[PDB]
């Protein structure tokens, strides 16, 4: 009756997991924002050529088995082009231009909305030419750096999982959906030795 569930906003809603980060007993992690890490949301985003949106992250943080301890954490967002932290006690942790959030483990999870961060007018997953070496574009949404505050070591293993919604989606120039398995995370390199057919076979053309 209604054609509102196939709209481009309802196709890309419903925030899903993009990364699970373990920090067991260095002392920090860097997770650069990329979406072509899972099989879903890559095959769903490669239906189009140009997409423009803004993300919204959520940081569900706990111990390796459920439990929560009163521990203070810092999630620093390094913008595209700013230098990433090198060590746990680097200069980049106190830089005023890298926005951070400070949240306990015993809180609701921290939410952060990141705007459209490209110098072009839309992200492109497919770049035909060369940027200069390989045939890849320069979308480069950012980087999340995560550590526990304080100068000595926290005796608590920290595992957080990152969820992400996609808001204000606009999409251009549709494209065939990929039927071949993925090999790498930058190029559309398929396995050329065996090619999976799109359909499943049957006995004869009349055996329905």
């Amino acid at each position: 009756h209604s054609t509102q569930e196939t709209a481009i906003g309802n196709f890309f809603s419903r925030a899903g997991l993009v990364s699970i980060i373990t920090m067991p007993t260095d002392g920090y992690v860097n997770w650069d924002i990329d979406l072509m890490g899972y099989a879903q949301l890559r095959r769903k985003c490669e239906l189009f050529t140009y997409m423009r949106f803004d993300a919204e992250f959520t940081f569900v943080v706990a111990k390796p088995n459920g439990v929560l301890v009163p521990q203070l954490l810092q999630y620093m967002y390094v913008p595209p082009g700013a230098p990433k932290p090198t060590s746990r006690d680097s200069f980049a942790w106190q830089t005023a231009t890298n926005p951070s959030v400070f949240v306990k483990m015993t809180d609701p999870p921290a939410q952060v909305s990141v705007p459209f961060m490209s110098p072009a007018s839309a992200y492109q997953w497919f770049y035909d030419g060369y940027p200069t070496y390989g045939q890849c574009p320069n979308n480069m949404m950012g980087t999340f750096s995560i550590r526990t505050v304080g100068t000595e070591k926290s005796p608590h293993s920290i595992t957080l999982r990152v969820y992400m919604r996609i808001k204000h989606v606009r999409a251009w120039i549709p494209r065939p959906l990929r039927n071949q398995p993925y090999l790498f995370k930058t190029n559309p390199n398929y396995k050329g030795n065996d090619i999976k057919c799109t359909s499943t076979s049957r006995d004869k053309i009349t055996t329905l």
């Binding site: 035909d128 251009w172 549709p174 190029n187």
Partner: protein
């Protein structure tokens, strides 16, 4: 039958008003004028397909190609005209489609990602050498050449890019795939190889 004379070029095509406009938009100004009849490809009984990259296909020909190495910027639409010359005792079917940001895959060198004026061939045409299936290529701007009914196929392509001006030397905007879905057949004694002729005309070209 008409006689199209723009520039100092002259072609002879019939009154076929089967022009497909890519995404319903004419090429326009506010973000050379001749025909460039390329070399002919010989459609044999077991030929797989061909592709040409744009605007790399017009950087080895004259006055537009010599403008391509200069001025560092480029923005234009196009007008592709693919036609076939066969008798009434031949049979077959082609699929002529354009594909924006046609990034190929590897089972890639500097020769196959931009083949030049002559155009390269397809290795595995079922997956378009890119992992996406041939069965869904008609979501792109396409046109069928059924040798039973018609012989020509003409597509009007506007300028599609995330930036209003790009360097024509490194980035290629789209591709042009001509794939024999139904293979060519004839009886013994007829002409074994059928020529396919591609004619390109740049529409609304700017450089600054």
């Amino acid at each position: 039958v008409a006689q199209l004379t723009i520039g100092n070029s002259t072609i002879t095509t019939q009154e076929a008003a089967n022009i497909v406009i890519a995404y319903g938009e004419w090429p326009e100004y506010c973000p050379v004028n001749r025909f460039f009849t390329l070399d002919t490809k010989s459609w044999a009984k077991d030929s797989k397909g061909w592709y040409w990259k744009f605007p790399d296909v017009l950087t080895e020909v004259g006055v537009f190609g010599q403008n391509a190495q200069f001025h560092y910027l480029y923005r234009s639409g196009f007008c592709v005209h693919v036609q076939c010359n066969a008798s009434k005792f031949h049979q077959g079917a082609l699929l002529v489609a354009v594909l924006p940001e046609y990034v190929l895959g590897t089972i890639p060198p500097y020769a196959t990602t931009q083949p030049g004026q002559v155009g390269a061939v397809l290795t595995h045409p079922y997956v378009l050498d890119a992992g996406i299936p041939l069965s869904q290529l008609t979501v792109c701007p396409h046109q069928w050449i059924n040798l039973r009914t018609n012989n020509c196929a003409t597509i009007i392509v506007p300028y599609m890019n995330t930036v209003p001006f790009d360097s024509a030397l490194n980035h290629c905007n789209f591709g042009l795939l001509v794939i024999p879905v139904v293979p060519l057949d004839f009886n013994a004694g007829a002409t074994s190889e059928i020529p396919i002729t591609v004619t390109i005309a740049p529409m609304c070209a700017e450089f600054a």
